[PDB]
Design a protein around this nucleic acid. Structure first.
Ligand code: DCP
Ligand code: DCP
Ligand code: MN
Ligand code: MN
Lengths: 407, 408
DNA sequence: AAGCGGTTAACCG
DNA sequence: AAGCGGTTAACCG
């Protein structure tokens, strides 16, 4: 089977591993990094082993580890797997997306944008604002509660059996999407087992296949909803319905509830969940994918700016505490030294402002820059007060220039 | 042959490629890493091509590029930049020669040799020297070989390793790897820089992984001869220390060293004529070795090493002051030299340097260097307070180094 | 247009 | 103790 042969090819497996290591080497978890160093060493052989197993069809997905990601909703069920699992999983995604028509068709879908190669949030935001200015005068925006968890692996499998034409790739794909948690007993003891995809409901959050799986799951939804003069733009779970009449979108959301109902999914009702979903005249402006889409103006959603000001606020108080602490105290992290804090704050402004460069949030950005400018001025004066009466050593640990005598 | 089989191992080759990739991917050179990313793409095939060729013995080293590199003094480092396949096969050769060749493992093994050897550091040599002093070595001569890589003779190196390798194919690969062929030779000849590069049998390429091992193999006869008759010779690459009970014993040793070096075509800086490259005198008073000042009681960074550090730090502060003035009036700033970014980098320079001399015990000069830092620092604050007193918010953000969202 | 062997950003050849 | 897809470090799911 040429499809299966691609999966066992060393070009694919090394391509996949390149993708996996790019993450592992940066992992906060030392074990993941070191497991990757152990895989990077013996690299020709460490992938040939997998290639060998895959070829003789005796590859074994190792038991995973289910952890709880700090989360509004229930702690995200993060399924962390060994490197060979992640490598074989990333391999499957690469071969599926270049060789399977249904996959490329699902990637092709014009109204789907999340987790699709060559597709970005900005493109959706553009299409949305294009629908207004073509007769979109009202909206509903909603998302699927616990989407992955409610995804059914039996429906996933049944949709994929036709377009696979390789019973071996079917077995591999089947084992790829199972979750066998090795810490299951500890997880039962905390009463946490039930949120993980240990049964047929759910896909592993943390597998590379799951976003494709999700997008395949809503293939039917995407088609049904783009009809009746109602335009639906979906990024992952989030869907924006755009229409001429409030009545029209209201009915469409009702059709959506039935459409997601067939496949086990609900959708936050805008009137019921104003903080999770939205409804109204597209003119008032609406929040979508972190932007506020007004037809005159487009900018990051207030919540995104709020988050950003809160992260900035935290850093600045962190610095102030440190400036007093470093004076009169020998030990400091030095992360919060004036030099380090400003350096972090500068790169935070870079990283965030870099993603919103498409947005024109200038009235808001100037306020965010006004917030930063004021915060910067305060700390500067705060430190000069302390520096005004300070010996060289104190200023050194305050400013963040290490002392050689203490190394 | 097991030796050659080893070199044609894709695990051997990939190991070599990993080390080459780590260097090329951080390379300042536009050309060099572009070449490396392309090799990382197509990686599976990129290396089998080399493996096929190595197994077939059809492998061809490609033409290299010679670069005279400005060095302190009028001296130039003859850089030989090679294509990625050259570089991979050469690191492959090094990795195999150092794990399978008995002579090679013995040369790395020698106790008195420390440069470019795995599991070996400058401190281990400084420690060995102090012990020799503790057991009665009260006088020393320290010297260096001029242009050592340039004067090594490939034919002697081949003669030394030919009995040990036991494979004609390994020997042929080694000869091709040692050899230098330059694409840029006509341009160098017009320059007059052609002679510096190892185009001839004399010399070993700088920028080749093999060349540091070759030098250790070349000086192995010197290492045994020097460590005799009450004299301990400790060598890191070219640099050598002769340790003895009496000045006469060290003086006699230097003459012996020149003779051992002379047979192999090498020479040493004279301790009386050149203060910078050789020293002579009593170990009880201090002497410099490998950037350390080795006193029987105290070890510290050497005075030259501290001057470099003081200059590197001074440069950083000069740049910071200039940018302080520039980032106020203009917007074309580099930002690397903004107050926040400047102070942050200086801190990490101070980290890395103090980390290098943790094996030293002298605090007096560390304290004086700390004082100099605090002086330049407080000056820079004076310069920042001044500029910012007459400043709007936009200038304050450009000076301090907290970029504006508007300018993204 | 910037390379190599090595060490706990840096250091030594 | 920390994962995934996608995009010009971050953002969005
Ligand atoms: N860091 C990650 C990783 C994966 N996903 C995936 C899994 C979710 O099922 C899907 C939908 O995105 P949501 O943020 O809406 O996630 P949930 O549907 O789980 O949350 P909620 O119940 O709050 O809608 O996106 C995600 O959102 N965020
Ligand atoms: N950055 C460096 C420093 C040194 N070396 C190698 C090649 C040199 O020939 C050898 C000896 O180091 P020296 O610094 O003593 O250099 P030279 O012997 O070439 O010059 P000099 O006459 O100044 O001693 O170490 C190197 O490859 N790269
Ligand atoms: Mn959701
Ligand atoms: Mn020299």
């Amino acid at each position: 089977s040429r499809l299966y042969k691609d999966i066992c090819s060393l070009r694919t497996l090394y391509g996949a591993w390149r993708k996996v290591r790019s993450s592992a080497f940066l992992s906060s978890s030392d074990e993941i990094r070191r497991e990757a160093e152990e895989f990077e060493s013996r690299l020709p052989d460490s992938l040939i082993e997998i290639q060998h197993a895959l070829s003789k069809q005796i590859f074994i997905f190792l038991q995973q580890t289910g952890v709880a990601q700090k989360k509004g909703g229930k702690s995200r069920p993060l399924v962390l797997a060994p490197i060979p699992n992640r490598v074989v999983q990333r391999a499957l995604l690469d071969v599926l997306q270049r060789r399977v028509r249904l996959v490329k068709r699902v990637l092709g879908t014009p109204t789907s944008y999340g987790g699709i190669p060559d597709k970005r949030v900005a493109m959706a935001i553009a299409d949305a604002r294009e629908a207004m200015r073509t007769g979109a005068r009202f909206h509903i925006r909603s998302d699927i509660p616990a989407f992955f968890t409610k995804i059914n692996k039996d429906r996933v499998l049944e949709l994929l059996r036709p377009h696979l034409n390789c019973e071996a790739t079917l077995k591999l794909f089947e084992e790829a999407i199972r979750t066998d948690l090795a810490n299951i007993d500890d997880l039962r003891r905390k009463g946490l087992d039930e949120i993980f995809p240990i049964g047929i409901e759910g896909v592993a959050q943390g597998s590379p296949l799951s976003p494709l799986l999700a997008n395949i799951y809503l293939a039917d939804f995407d088609l049904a909803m783009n009809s009746n003069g109602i335009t639906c733009l979906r990024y992952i779970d989030d869907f924006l319905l755009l229409g001429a009449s409030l009545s029209d979108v209201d009915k469409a959301f009702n059709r959506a509830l039935k459409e997601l109902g067939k496949i086990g999914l609900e959708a936050y009702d805008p009137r019921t969940d104003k903080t999770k979903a939205s409804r109204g005249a597209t003119e008032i402006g609406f929040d979508f994918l972190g932007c506020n889409v007004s037809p005159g103006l487009i900018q990051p959603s207030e919540a995104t700016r709020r988050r950003f000001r809160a992260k900035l606020d935290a850093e600045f108080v962190a610095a102030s505490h440190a400036l007093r602490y470093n004076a009169q105290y020998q030990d400091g992290d030095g992360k919060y030294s004036y030099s380090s804090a400003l350096y972090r704050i500068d790169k935070i402004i870079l990283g965030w402002g870099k993603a919103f460069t498409f947005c024109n949030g200038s009235q808001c950005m100037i306020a965010l820059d006004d917030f930063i400018s004021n915060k910067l001025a305060q700390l500067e004066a705060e430190k000069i007060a302390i520096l005004a009466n300070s010996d060289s050593t104190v200023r050194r640990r305050v400013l963040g220039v290490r002392l050689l005598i203490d190394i």
